Design a protein around this motif. Structure first.
Motif, PDB file in Angstrom:
ATOM      1  N   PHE G  56       0.844  -1.181   0.000  1.00 52.47           N
ATOM      2  CA  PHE G  56       0.000   0.000   0.000  1.00 52.47           C
ATOM      3  C   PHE G  56       0.882   1.234   0.000  1.00 52.47           C
ATOM      4  CE2 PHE G  56      -1.703  -3.346   2.685  1.00 52.47           C
ATOM      5  CZ  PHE G  56      -2.831  -3.679   1.994  1.00 52.47           C
ATOM      6  N   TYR G  58      -0.095   4.337   1.022  1.00 51.40           N
ATOM      7  CA  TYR G  58      -0.434   5.190   2.150  1.00 51.40           C
ATOM      8  C   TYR G  58      -1.116   4.350   3.212  1.00 51.40           C
ATOM      9  CZ  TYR G  58       0.183   8.855  -1.318  1.00 51.40           C
ATOM     10  OH  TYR G  58       0.695   9.674  -2.289  1.00 51.40           O
ATOM     11  N   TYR G 125       0.337   7.901   6.603  1.00 46.18           N
ATOM     12  CA  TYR G 125       1.761   7.630   6.517  1.00 46.18           C
ATOM     13  C   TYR G 125       2.145   7.356   5.076  1.00 46.18           C
ATOM     14  CZ  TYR G 125       1.895   6.940  11.595  1.00 46.18           C
ATOM     15  OH  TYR G 125       1.810   7.085  12.955  1.00 46.18           O
ATOM     16  N   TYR G 126       3.257   7.932   4.648  1.00 48.09           N
ATOM     17  CA  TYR G 126       3.834   7.587   3.362  1.00 48.09           C
ATOM     18  C   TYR G 126       4.619   6.296   3.505  1.00 48.09           C
ATOM     19  CZ  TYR G 126       2.849  12.286   1.645  1.00 48.09           C
ATOM     20  OH  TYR G 126       2.236  13.435   1.225  1.00 48.09           O
ATOM     21  N   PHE G 128       5.848   5.089   0.550  1.00 50.70           N
ATOM     22  CA  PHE G 128       6.755   5.466  -0.524  1.00 50.70           C
ATOM     23  C   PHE G 128       6.530   6.930  -0.842  1.00 50.70           C
ATOM     24  CE2 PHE G 128       6.027   1.000  -1.034  1.00 50.70           C
ATOM     25  CZ  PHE G 128       7.282   0.511  -1.255  1.00 50.70           C
ATOM     26  N   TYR G 129       7.600   7.715  -0.853  1.00 52.85           N
ATOM     27  CA  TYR G 129       7.515   9.146  -1.114  1.00 52.85           C
ATOM     28  C   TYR G 129       8.562   9.495  -2.158  1.00 52.85           C
ATOM     29  CZ  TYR G 129       7.579  14.171  -0.003  1.00 52.85           C
ATOM     30  OH  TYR G 129       7.569  15.540  -0.054  1.00 52.85           O
ATOM     31  N   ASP G 130       8.114  10.072  -3.268  1.00 53.46           N
ATOM     32  CA  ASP G 130       8.902  10.269  -4.474  1.00 53.46           C
ATOM     33  C   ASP G 130       9.640  11.601  -4.480  1.00 53.46           C
ATOM     34  OD1 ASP G 130      10.048   9.912  -6.955  1.00 53.46           O
ATOM     35  OD2 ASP G 130       8.191  10.039  -8.092  1.00 53.46           O
ATOM     36  N   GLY G 131       9.762  12.261  -3.341  1.00 53.87           N
ATOM     37  CA  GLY G 131      10.208  13.631  -3.335  1.00 53.87           C
ATOM     38  C   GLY G 131      11.139  13.912  -2.177  1.00 53.87           C
ATOM     39  N   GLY G 144      12.868  10.001  -0.318  1.00 52.63           N
ATOM     40  CA  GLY G 144      12.001   9.013   0.268  1.00 52.63           C
ATOM     41  C   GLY G 144      11.275   9.522   1.492  1.00 52.63           C
ATOM     42  N   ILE G 145      10.786   8.565   2.288  1.00 49.65           N
ATOM     43  CA  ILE G 145       9.871   8.870   3.381  1.00 49.65           C
ATOM     44  C   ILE G 145      10.580   9.248   4.668  1.00 49.65           C
ATOM     45  CG2 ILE G 145       8.167   7.308   2.456  1.00 49.65           C
ATOM     46  CD1 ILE G 145       8.951   5.355   4.699  1.00 49.65           C
ATOM     47  N   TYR G 193      14.649   2.677   4.642  1.00 55.64           N
ATOM     48  CA  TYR G 193      14.120   3.891   4.036  1.00 55.64           C
ATOM     49  C   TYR G 193      14.463   3.986   2.559  1.00 55.64           C
ATOM     50  CZ  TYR G 193      13.124   5.510   8.724  1.00 55.64           C
ATOM     51  OH  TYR G 193      12.639   5.627  10.002  1.00 55.64           O
ATOM     52  N   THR G 195      14.598   2.085  -1.268  1.00 52.13           N
ATOM     53  CA  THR G 195      13.916   1.085  -2.065  1.00 52.13           C
ATOM     54  C   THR G 195      14.860   0.299  -2.964  1.00 52.13           C
ATOM     55  OG1 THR G 195      12.048   0.751  -3.552  1.00 52.13           O
ATOM     56  CG2 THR G 195      13.434   2.638  -3.919  1.00 52.13           C
TER      57      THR G 195
ATOM     58  N   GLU H 167       3.608   7.837  -6.507  1.00 57.02           N
ATOM     59  CA  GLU H 167       4.783   7.792  -5.643  1.00 57.02           C
ATOM     60  C   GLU H 167       5.736   6.680  -6.079  1.00 57.02           C
ATOM     61  OE1 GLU H 167       5.411  10.078  -3.509  1.00 57.02           O
ATOM     62  OE2 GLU H 167       3.443  11.011  -3.666  1.00 57.02           O
ATOM     63  N   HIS H 168       6.339   6.873  -7.242  1.00 57.16           N
ATOM     64  CA  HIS H 168       7.268   5.886  -7.771  1.00 57.16           C
ATOM     65  C   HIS H 168       8.650   6.281  -7.291  1.00 57.16           C
ATOM     66  CE1 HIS H 168       9.727   3.792 -10.866  1.00 57.16           C
ATOM     67  NE2 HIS H 168       8.762   2.895 -10.808  1.00 57.16           N
ATOM     68  N   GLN H 169       9.173   5.537  -6.332  1.00 58.14           N
ATOM     69  CA  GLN H 169      10.411   5.884  -5.658  1.00 58.14           C
ATOM     70  C   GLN H 169      11.518   5.041  -6.267  1.00 58.14           C
ATOM     71  OE1 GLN H 169      10.189   5.669  -1.430  1.00 58.14           O
ATOM     72  NE2 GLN H 169      12.360   6.082  -1.131  1.00 58.14           N
ATOM     73  N   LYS H 257       9.416  19.857  -5.334  1.00 59.48           N
ATOM     74  CA  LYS H 257      10.130  18.807  -4.623  1.00 59.48           C
ATOM     75  C   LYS H 257       9.468  17.450  -4.795  1.00 59.48           C
ATOM     76  CE  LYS H 257      10.061  20.712  -0.626  1.00 59.48           C
ATOM     77  NZ  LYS H 257      10.312  20.876   0.825  1.00 59.48           N
ATOM     78  N   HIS H 258       8.147  17.397  -4.718  1.00 59.33           N
ATOM     79  CA  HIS H 258       7.421  16.140  -4.657  1.00 59.33           C
ATOM     80  C   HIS H 258       6.796  15.839  -6.011  1.00 59.33           C
ATOM     81  CE1 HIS H 258       4.095  13.532  -2.620  1.00 59.33           C
ATOM     82  NE2 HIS H 258       5.040  12.803  -3.177  1.00 59.33           N
ATOM     83  N   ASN H 259       7.170  14.706  -6.599  1.00 60.84           N
ATOM     84  CA  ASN H 259       6.551  14.211  -7.820  1.00 60.84           C
ATOM     85  C   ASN H 259       5.588  13.103  -7.432  1.00 60.84           C
ATOM     86  OD1 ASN H 259       8.022  15.927  -9.450  1.00 60.84           O
ATOM     87  ND2 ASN H 259       9.647  14.430  -9.784  1.00 60.84           N
TER      88      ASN H 259
END
Lengths: 303, 235, 226, 226, 235, 235, 226, 303
Positions: G56, G58, G125-126, G128-131, G144-145, G193, G195, H167-169, H257-259
């Motif tokens: 998941f 989130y 909660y994240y 996975f965070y892409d930023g 990341g998160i 933290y 991936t 959120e593709h990390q 910052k956030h994609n």
């Protein structure tokens, strides 16, 4: 907590909220109060429920004898119906072509003959279009009608026990830890002549136990009466009939791997000729698949 | 907060108690319950089913099928054919469905039901006296002393006369399963009323006997059956 | 809420299958040597409790497991559902499981107890199964009830060694439904999952291969003199 | 639900047979030497509690048993119903029983307590029985109440040895029904199950076979001068 | 979850407490309860039954049946025949049904009932004075000081006059079973009102005495009766 | 005060139990819950989504995108193109959304849904036989033995005929996720009905396959998925 | 009051996200060496529980923390909310806090358990965070998160040393709300933290810099022969 | 205590008086009782809810293709509205000037091309007055419409997977512990051509993972179908359309910052020319910001 949806009331409460977390199971009542026998056991007379279903003829073959038929576990055979079934797939009903009396090889009953057994459905695997439907289908269920018929004169003597054991698991012929072989517990129509007991009986390839007293499984004869049975006494009756429903935990099983019945015939008292000179008499067995169902059609499982 | 007290027998673990317990594997879905023939809700209904008594158990005959039947012939004077001392701890009864259900329970009550079956030819005929001597009586030693108790005349050519119902005759309300002189239940013996007459001189009868519980049989105080023993671990 | 009247006792209420089998008996003993112990859940090991289930061909029951240990200070039990690998030692990484249910206890506090509902997969447990798992020609065929189920296994470790090593597993069948009655067993079990009664006493030397029944029938001097 | 009014106390409520006999008293002491101990359940051993039951010819009562032990770490009690063989030692295979009720406890947690309902077999217990179990000519006749019942026995083992060996069994008659009143005993008991009061003090040497009553009557110098 | 508290006296085991306990042997069926004659629901009803007082207990007479009766003859001047100091711990009372029910309880209340019975021939005649001196009085030493308390004139040829009822005269509400100077209950003494006149000179009377509780007798604080002692284990 | 008892399993700590717990940080105000797209309330709905089966997993092709597709060409005689032995523990199924949701649960039930997709040019045409052999049958080895089970004829130029629904055919009610001879679920095999006919000789087809659960799929007894292993600590 | 009917079990009730993630699993192990131990609350460390949350994108959940310790005699746990300095040792003056919530327990009594409600600060909660936390040109950007939250940390001390040093933190997500589904992870985690799945087995010597996937796909000899 | 404001009732009780002290969450009912699929997943057809919102034209630019549009998570994009929003400050809606189709640089699809990805909103940062509003505002939220269009002939072959991953990390290209650089995960409109896997791929400055099979994050392809996706098969369709709402925990995030999305295009089956001689075909991507909102105006965050 939870609950659920000389006389002592109690508040029904599941402290842990769940079934199967509950304690032991008693017999509830809604209001105050203020059984001895089970006719299903004791092998009823097939009139002890109803005789409308039965001169006995299944599927193009006739038996003329039917108050002395024993109805195993007081339950009449019937199709799987629904709601008790796993697959929704519509089973096949062969009816009168594969539901008919199949008479097997007769067996001489002599002095010193210890017994015989047949596994079912196995005995019928080569018999007719019942034995064809076994191989071409994944699963199947059937009720059977066993008619055992042994005729001697008024000069002869001796008695047989004709019993049908659900899930009769044979003991290995002795000693070490071995599973009885697939081939020795699937003899075909010829069944298995019990030749023991002896210390000289061969032990190889998982051969089954040859001792008739312990039922080959380690439980005495004379307690074999807890199963559906008849006692053929040559002073009284020459024949036997037993109607078994389909007994199993599963709605349908393979029929090649799993033998869910056994027909055991034990010479409880030996055969003594009278003034007559006849030392041996044939015993004949006639099995009728009844209310048989097949599903999961495939290529013949035949090797 | 709330003034609870823990009496004696609180943190106990009793084998035979009844208590709810947490379910490991919650939400587990049991497979559906179909209709299987033969449901048994009570183990006394096994005791109700006839089962053959090993009435011939002697040096040679034990361990064989011949342990279940007695040989009767024609005799000029009455003899005592068989004696079944009435105890549920005795090899005669202990090994049947009746006796081996009752050896889990420390004492019992009600009536035994004993049926006899003669395996012979159709031309043979016989009259047998089946006599139950109540508690406190000696074993009869002759037929005139056996007839004075409960008895039935079992006649061949009927097979409605086979069954004798051992009545419940006792001081106390229950009888101990293990034979003792205080509660001892008496003796069922078999005699020749008249004779066993074969169709030809030298003929031979063969007699079998069964035992089952009567509907008023009751048992109590479940215990370890002497009928099983484990002398080494199973591997 | 509901007041649920029953009775005190009825006549044969001792004998109903719920009360007959509804006592908690020992189904196995293990030892904590190395601080690890493992037991595959079965009733085949103990001959007395095995004989009672075998009055019946089919049983459907919940079971509650009670662990009686003479060890102390802390312990972990892990119920390993079928089809995966259990922890083979203490300090095994597989003792860390997001999913496999486990129970911690301190043996001096109380006796841990949990319930395993009916897992049978067949709608009832086979006490006796007359058939094989693999087809005809297959080389290794298990006969009997061994393939028909597995009730899981219980892995035991000890985080604080302290006292004795002896674990005892008492389980109580509850919510029992028993179906096809069978003759009581007349003979002492010589194996697990196997119905064979021939003992084979000896191994090493001469007079081997004579084997015993070990039945419970005993004789009397004379019929009619009893 | 029901509110069941009684009273605080009535005048003689001290003296009713329920309160008179309804105290938990010691019926026997055993020692755990070898880690095993065994006690056949009876009130014959302790003269004080025996004297109170013997105001009455017949009693019908439940009993609750409370085990006070100075041992520790774990224990097992097994109530062995009549007619079978009890475990003769610890590490005896007969401690594994599918049926015989048993109770585990850790003596430092609490005192274990259970209840044995009325087993009497006769509809009441004989305190005094004037008759024999075997008939006239029989060679060994037990006289008195010894054959009339057996209340079972309690087998004790210790899984963790630890502390003292001394077990004490306190039981409380409850739900008592007493019937035919008798004179209180005037004399010190010299045996179990036997009503004979003659003591026979000595054994080995001379002045043997003079025996004493040991009664509780004591004299006064003069009538009329008291 | 629920905030319970365990006060002091929670994990206690008290001999005299009242608590429910788990039933080992569940489902056990007790044998039926028939009607036995003589049910006794309370142990004071034993104290109500007359029982002979060992009024003659001296060096020689103790241990024999003669310990229960006193000999009276014709005497020219009144004598004090008998004194029964009123205590339930005293051998006189302690050994009766009254006194040995009351020695389980640490103190009592109510009236004693003392009956006298003279065993003589039908021709003898006598007048006796039975006097109870209350607590605090001396034992009388002569009849004129005995008559000033509670007294009855017991006359032979009636046997309706035998029973004297010792009244309850006390400061406190209860009297200690074990004799002490504070609660001491007084003295019952027997005197010659006139004389015991035999049918022939040299005749001899014989007197017995019984004691039972009155319906207003009460007891409390059950304890260990001094009337039993175990000095060695029973085997 | 109140007579509570603590049975066995009271002071236990069970991972899988359900119990209320005190809140550290009381009065803490959780940040508001907005509407996020995609809420999933149950993890079986992931198993419902089609996912490509790694139908080509061999020495060279594993670890690459080419592990997902099979090459088909025109052949004179029928061949067996592909076999998907039906197990949720097998790399074919275990690595999909279906199989890797079902490897958390110790056994399952219901129907698998297998869709085939041919990637070729628009001028190619083909007829394929997709056959499911039930439990207990051998793998067919020739098309005449494959056709006798469940089968569908997948024809290009339709893409309504791609999906075969593996029926639920079983003795027991549930099938073990880990392959065993007792519950084994059978075989899905792919054959050439007629041929794959390219627009020009030497043409080449490429076949992909997906698997998803049917709405009657069910699982039970959550466990540790074999699909993750931690051999060293994460730092 | 309210009687709140549910069910016993439904078909897939095993599989709903509340029951799927609603088991208490180990999120970290620490050791009490020096009598002090500290653990920053995260699920990143344990690969099995980490893989389940990562179906998941989130999650919004409460967590209850259960501390399983083999130590004895007394212990203190201090939940240190973000943004302050935690106690660095036992006997640190910062163990005296008017505000920071802490929990005392005696490990032999029971297992301490408390609840941490949803602190997420983001409404979920994240996983996975892409930023990045810092802007473009910033020199150190955490990806990341890791910046997105901190769930606090748990400080452990031991007031009475006594037994073992090993602390285990089991937490149970409860009241779970999961949102965007993701593919299950196919590869063994090599970091926290992060991936990234490339393992980099070696360090010191030659044959360094060859790195492994460590995936779970395994081969078969022939397609069509399976 | 507290409470709160085969079928088992239970008294709802908080023993500790609080929410979140409560146990695990079940499904309540008020009275007695006496679900299988989630259409939000599985990427509906945008007609599977409603088609009234849609020939596709946003903001002065036209697409003519719309039953085959997949509506991501079955939710149509919409403005933040209220009550789900943090700040009360009124967001800016650029509407048709910044909500329009922006077509990016086409990419040759060749034999051996492993894949491509674009991060969003990032790809649009230099595009029009959408890419201006990113820099001049603190926060922002937008839904997107991705139209991926690749046309070949009936002689060509091969398939693409067009997926949108929330959120593709990305995983770092290998070895040690490094965060991928801000610059490598923010490529601009050109996106990132996946050139791996190889052991020779450069490891420096946090470069992202080049392996298409593991999705660059360590999760297999073929499970990439759990996200909103379409499969472009040159035998069937030439184009793709995906409508994504705004997925995030926060009402508005930075957008620099956030994609919060990634557009991944993977050549699932390679591109094979037929009898034709064309070895490569362009793939074109056209992104439309839709229902975009901006708040927190400031000086341009541009360096």
């Amino acid at each position: 907590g939870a609950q659920v949806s000389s006389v002592i009331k109690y508040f029904n409460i599941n402290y842990y909220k769940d079934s199967a977390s509950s304690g032991l199971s008693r017999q509830d009542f809604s209001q105050d109060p203020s059984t001895l026998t089970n006719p299903a056991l004791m092998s009823p007379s097939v009139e002890a429920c109803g005789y409308s279903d039965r001169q006995i003829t299944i599927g193009n073959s006739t038996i003329t004898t039917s108050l002395h038929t024993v109805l195993a576990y007081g339950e009449w055979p019937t199709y799987l119906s629904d709601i008790d079934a796993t697959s929704v797939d519509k089973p096949t009903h062969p009816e009168t072509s594969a539901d008919r009396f199949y008479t097997l090889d007769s067996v001489e009953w002599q002095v010193g003959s210890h017994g015989w057994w047949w596994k079912l459905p196995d005995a019928l695997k080569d018999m007719g279009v019942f034995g064809q439907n076994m191989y071409y289908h994944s699963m199947g269920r059937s009720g059977f009608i066993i008619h055992t018929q042994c005729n001697a004169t008024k000069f002869h003597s001796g008695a047989l026990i004709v019993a049908v054991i659900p899930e009769h698991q044979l003991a290995y012929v002795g000693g070490v830890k071995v599973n009885v072989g697939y081939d020795h517990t699937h003899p075909g129509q010829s069944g298995h002549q019990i030749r023991g007991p002896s210390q000289s009986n061969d032990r190889s390839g998982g051969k089954p136990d040859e001792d008739p007293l312990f039922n080959c499984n380690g439980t005495l004869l004379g307690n074999i009466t807890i199963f559906p049975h008849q006692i053929i006494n040559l002073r009284t009756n020459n024949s036997s009939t037993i109607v078994v429903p389909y007994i199993n935990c599963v709605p349908m099983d393979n029929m090649l791997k799993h033998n869910n019945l056994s027909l055991v015939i034990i010479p409880l008292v030996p055969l003594r000729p009278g003034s007559s000179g006849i030392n041996s008499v044939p015993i004949t067995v006639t099995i009728a698949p009844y209310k048989s169902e097949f599903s999961g059609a495939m290529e013949a499982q035949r090797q | 907060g709330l003034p609870t007290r823990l009496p004696s027998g609180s943190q106990q673990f009793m084998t035979t108690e009844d208590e709810q317990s947490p379910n490991i594997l919650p939400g587990f879905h049991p497979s559906k319950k179909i209709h299987i023939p033969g449901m048994i809700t009570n183990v006394m209904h096994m005791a109700r089913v006839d089962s053959f008594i090993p009435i011939n158990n002697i040096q040679g005959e034990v361990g064989k099928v011949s342990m279940y039947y007695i040989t009767v012939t024609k005799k000029t004077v009455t003899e005592r054919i068989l004696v079944l001392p009435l105890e549920m701890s005795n090899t005669l009864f202990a090994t049947t469905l009746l006796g081996e259900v009752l050896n889990y329970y420390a004492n019992w009550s009600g009536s035994i039901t004993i049926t006899f079956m003669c395996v012979c030819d159709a031309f043979s005929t016989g009259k047998f006296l089946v006599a139950y001597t109540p508690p406190g009586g000696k074993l009869p030693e002759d037929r005139k002393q056996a007839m004075l108790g409960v008895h039935i005349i079992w006649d061949l050519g009927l097979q409605s006369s086979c069954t004798i119902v051992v009545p419940w005759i006792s001081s106390g309300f229950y009888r101990r399963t293990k034979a003792d002189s205080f509660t001892h239940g008496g003796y069922v013996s078999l005699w020749y009323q008249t004779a066993f007459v074969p169709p030809v001189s030298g003929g031979t009868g063969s007699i079998l006997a069964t035992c089952s519980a009567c509907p008023d049989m009751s048992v109590r105080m479940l215990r370890d059956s002497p009928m099983m023993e484990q002398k080494n671990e199973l591997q | 809420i509901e007041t649920r009247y029953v009775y005190n006792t009825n006549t044969n209420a001792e004998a109903d299958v719920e009360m007959f089998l509804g006592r908690s008996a020992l189904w196995g003993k293990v030892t904590l040597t190395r601080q690890y112990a493992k037991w595959e859940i079965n009733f085949q090991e103990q001959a007395h409790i095995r004989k009672k289930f075998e009055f019946f061909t089919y049983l459907r029951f919940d079971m509650e497991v009670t662990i009686v240990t003479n060890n102390k200070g802390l312990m972990q039990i892990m119920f390993v559902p079928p089809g995966i690998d259990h922890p083979e030692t203490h300090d095994d990484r597989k003792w860390d499981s997001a999913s496999n249910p486990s129970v911690f206890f301190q043996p001096k506090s109380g006796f841990p107890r949990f319930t395993i509902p009916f897992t049978g997969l067949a709608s009832a447990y086979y006490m006796f199964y007359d058939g094989y798992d693999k087809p005809k020609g297959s080389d290794n065929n298990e006969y009997g009830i061994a393939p028909t189920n597995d009730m899981g296994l219980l892995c035991f470790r000890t985080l604080d060694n302290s006292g004795g090593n002896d674990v005892k597993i008492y389980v109580k069948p509850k919510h029992i439904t028993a179906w096809v009655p069978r003759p009581p067993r007349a003979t002492q079990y010589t194996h697990k999952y196997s119905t064979n009664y021939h003992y084979k006493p000896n191994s090493s030397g001469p007079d081997e291969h004579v084997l015993k029944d070990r039945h419970f029938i005993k004789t009397r001097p004379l019929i009619s003199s009893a």
